[PDB]
Amino acid sequence: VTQTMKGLDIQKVAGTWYSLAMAASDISLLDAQSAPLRVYVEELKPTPEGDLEILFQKWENGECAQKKIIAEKTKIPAVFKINKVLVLDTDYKKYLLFCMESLACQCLVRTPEVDDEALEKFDKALKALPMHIRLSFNPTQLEEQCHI
Numbered sequence: 001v002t003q004t005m006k007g008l009d010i011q012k013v014a015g016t017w018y019s020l021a022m023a024a025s026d027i028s029l030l031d032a033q034s035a036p037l038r039v040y041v042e043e044l045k046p047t048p049e050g051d052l053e054i055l056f057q058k059w060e061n062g063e064c065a066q067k068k069i070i071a072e073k074t075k076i077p078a079v080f081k082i083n084k085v086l087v088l089d090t091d092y093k094k095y096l097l098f099c100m101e102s103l104a105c106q107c108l109v110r111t112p113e114v115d116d117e118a119l120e121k122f123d124k125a126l127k128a129l130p131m132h133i134r135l136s137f138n139p140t141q142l143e144e145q146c147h148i
């Protein structure tokens with residue numbers, strides 16, 4: 001992944017996000033509801049120290065579970081450690097593209113709407129990468145727990 005966000009201001013990614021689209025290098029990372037990188041971002045909470053707390057949902061044991069993880073800052077503002085989280089691109093107010101790296105990337109949006117522009121930038125960021133599965137969700141699914 002050789003696309004990072006230059007001048008990323010991590011405080012400005014705070015708040016609500018929707019996992020509009022997901023993509024992975026291997027089908028088994030996203031194919032099942034219980035697939036390991038099938039994670040639905042809920043909210044980003046950057047810390048004063050510039051770490052990133054992530055609230056998300058994950059289908060485990062036949063149900064939609066509320067989850068919390070801290071991604072720690074690095075010397076690079078656009079790269080965090082959990083496994084690396086890279087921020088590819090964001091305009092803060094509509095969309096944010098990220099990857100975790102075996103590789104999974106998402107298109108996050110601020111609202112439960114299909115943002116064609118953001119999905120274009122997403123597919124273009126992926127053009128390069130060796131993705132073998134891509135999912136996207138409709139507005140109804142975006143307002144349900146675990147996008148059911």
Ligand SMILES: CCCCCCCCCCCCCC(=O)O
Nearest residue numbers: 039041054058067069085087098
């Ligand atoms: C721009 C920041 C968005 C990054 C969101 C990272 C998503 C968190 C990945 C969670 C790892 C899965 C853990 C698990 O449930 O086993």
